[PDB]
């Protein structure tokens, strides 16, 4: 079974997810999944065609478990890991404002998403974070956007130039 919308990979993960019946285990697996399969910094591209869908199924499980385990105040203000969401948000924004350059900034924003994307952090705090982190990242990136030659930019990004035609 190798389909686009339905295949063995997806089925296999649905089964793995069905066996996550504790908030802490499920939340930890979601974050691990995000480190392994999301963003251009993912540890691997093996699940490139199904990670987006599998991630959502894992989120569903974490959300369901969190709502059952947390009291009302914690559901609104605590991350799935028991951290105070406002503190994390403020601490991350503080780091972003201290960012020396656009390279440090992108690491902060991207990492923040991989670690706290909702069922982990309450959406209210998370999107407030997007608002603030996204602003600084753009302010740093869009300054003198064209000054660096492609030859040098490729080096800065650290890609391996495989082939060039002009």
């Amino acid at each position: 079974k190798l389909g686009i919308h339905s295949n063995d990979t997806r089925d296999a993960w649905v089964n793995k997810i069905a066996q996550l019946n504790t908030l802490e285990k499920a939340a930890e697996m979601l974050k691990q999944f995000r480190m392994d399969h999301t963003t251009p910094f993912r540890n691997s591209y093996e699940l490139d065609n199904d990670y987006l869908w599998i991630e959502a199924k894992l989120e569903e499980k974490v959300a369901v478990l969190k709502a059952r385990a947390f009291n009302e105040v914690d559901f609104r203000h605590k991350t799935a890991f028991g951290e105070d969401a406002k503190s994390v948000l403020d601490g991350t924004v503080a780091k972003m404002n201290a960012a020396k350059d656009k390279w440090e900034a992108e690491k902060i924003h991207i990492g923040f998403r991989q670690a706290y994307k909702p069922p982990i952090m309450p959406v209210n705090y998370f999107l407030d974070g997007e608002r603030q982190l996204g602003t600084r990242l753009m302010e740093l990136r869009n300054l003198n956007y064209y000054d660096t030659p492609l030859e040098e930019l490729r080096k800065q990004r650290g890609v391996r130039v495989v082939h060039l035609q002009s």
Binding site: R131, M138, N142, L143, G158, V162, H163, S166
Partner: protein, 510 residues
């Protein structure tokens, strides 16, 4: 005791005072810019009057459609090629209209001045109207036309082909993902002002020329609302002009927005017009130069000079890479015809003359290729031939720009022949231009769209088509066809017999 009342302007006079101050009264979206608190809007509308002016237009439109046009069998008496073209034109525009709703909701959230919010709000509502209007065109042609397949399920059958990906870039994600201002440039300052406003009108001309009076009726009505959106785009620039951030970022976001839009339109619009019609209205080459260079890049853009706006630095590259763009693309769209939701046709003798006449050198390149393909039996279901095979046999790989999603074949193109292949953290990336390459290098995490080859790798062609419902109601005949005639339609079995299997072209590199 005289009969008196109150109009829209009379209420609007006080609309600016509706917003009030409080600590957290600020946009929820990330942005490098600050929209002026006192920005005003051009049209003084209130909800009630807005609904009335649109209501009046609807009556006329639907009246013509349900009455006279239906009595004239206007849904049928259209050239086969144009009936197919509208499947794409109307449904693809639909998504632009739809995403523009979310886009203007985001701009409404961005604006702090009540009048500027109100202006964006009007567009939010207009774009919903347009979404439903474009939907109605497909709806009408499906119900009354010569071939409902595609018109009737484009919302899902569009997902099979590669042209759809690029459409989502300029008309979906480009409209709502990024700095609200960057989004406004993609949508209003470039998208609508440069391409959509002129485009919508042009489509009505090509439509009328090919017997279609359905589209003119709807699209001409859509056009009446555009003036307001133009003003929104213009006001976006005014609202942020006296902010220091503007001088630092405006022209960069504008240049990026321009290249983004152009990259897709330049080759696609021209392709739909010239290759998707029987009767021609005007050569895309001149249409493009007048639109982008004269009207937009000169008149329009120069009016915003007083606000620091400059002509896009990539304008020159766009023009140079434009001449053959659409011709280069149709070769690819036709070669991959089994992946669409519309029927395609090879240029006929009379058309080749027109092409050659208008684009010297067309026959020696594209002309001959199309002649070879028809000789190979590309129109015949028993030939066992799909143009794609020819690309394989002659070692001409087809790549997908990681950023714009626009398909390109550098080894066989007369236009741009650039190709940059990079490897980054275990993934291969292919770019077709120096502007999109910079975008990826600087913003890797904004462009992770997987291409069709990546998603379909190792899959047999007929299986992808079947899974994504690319069939007609008989469950056997393909929606897509390599010809627009009424007989000898290819079936899923004809494609399976081809035993065509997708492979990722970039994997060849070591």
């Amino acid at each position: 005791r005289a009969p008196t009342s109150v109009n829209a302007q009379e209420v609007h006079r006080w609309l600016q005072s509706f917003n009030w101050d409080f600590k957290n009264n600020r946009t929820k979206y990330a942005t490098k810019y600050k929209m002026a608190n006192e920005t005003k809007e051009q049209f003084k509308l209130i909800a009630k009057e807005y609904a009335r002016m649109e209501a009046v237009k609807d009556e006329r439109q639907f009246g013509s459609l349900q009455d006279a046009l239906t009595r004239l069998n206007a849904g049928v008496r259209v050239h086969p090629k144009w009936n197919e073209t509208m499947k794409v034109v109307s449904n693809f525009l639909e998504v632009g209209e739809y995403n523009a709703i979310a886009a203007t909701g985001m701009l409404w959230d961005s604006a702090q001045a009540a009048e500027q919010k109100n202006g964006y709000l009007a567009q939010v509502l207009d774009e919903i109207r347009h979404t439903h209007q474009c939907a109605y065109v497909n709806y009408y042609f499906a119900k009354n036309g010569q071939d409902p397949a595609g018109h009737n399920d484009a919302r899902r059958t569009r997902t099979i082909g590669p042209l759809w990906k690029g459409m989502k870039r300029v008309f979906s994600d480009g409209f709502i993902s990024g700095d609200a201002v960057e989004c406004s440039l993609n949508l209003q300052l470039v998208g609508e002002a440069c391409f959509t406003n002129p485009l919508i009108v042009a489509v009505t001309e090509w439509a009328a020329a090919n017997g279609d009076e359905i589209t003119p009726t709807v699209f001409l009505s859509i056009e009446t609302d555009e003036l307001r959106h133009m003003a929104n785009g213009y006001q976006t620039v005014v609202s942020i002009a006296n902010d220091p951030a503007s001088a630092k970022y405006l022209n960069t976001d504008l240049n990026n927005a321009f290249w983004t839009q152009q990259k897709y339109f330049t080759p696609v619009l021209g392709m739909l017009f010239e290759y998707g019609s029987k009767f021609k209205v005007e050569p895309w080459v001149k249409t493009w130069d007048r639109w982008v260079y004269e009207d937009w890049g000169g008149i329009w853009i120069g009016r915003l000079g007083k606000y620091g706006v400059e002509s896009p630095r990539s304008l020159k590259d766009a023009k140079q890479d434009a001449y053959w763009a659409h011709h280069d693309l149709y070769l690819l769209a036709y070669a991959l015809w089994p992946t669409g939701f519309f029927r395609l046709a090879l240029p006929d003798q009379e058309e080749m003359e027109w092409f050659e006449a208008n684009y010297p050198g067309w026959y020696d390149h594209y002309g001959k290729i199309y002649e070879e393909w028809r000789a190979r039996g590309c129109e015949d279901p028993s030939s066992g031939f799909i143009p794609l095979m020819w690309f394989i046999e002659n070692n001409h790989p087809i790549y997908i720009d990681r950023v714009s999603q626009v398909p390109f074949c550098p080894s066989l193109a007369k236009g741009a022949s650039t190709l940059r292949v990079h490897e980054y953290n275990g993934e291969m990336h292919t770019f077709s231009d120096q502007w999109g390459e910079r975008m990826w290098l600087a913003e890797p995490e904004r462009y992770e769209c997987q291409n069709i080859f990546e998603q379909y790798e190792g899959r047999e062609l007929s299986e992808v088509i079947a899974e994504l419902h690319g069939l007609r109601s008989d469950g056997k005949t393909l929606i897509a066809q390599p010809h627009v005639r009424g007989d000898k339609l290819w079936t899923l079995d004809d494609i399976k017999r081809l035993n065509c299997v997708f492979k990722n072209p970039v994997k060849a590199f070591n």
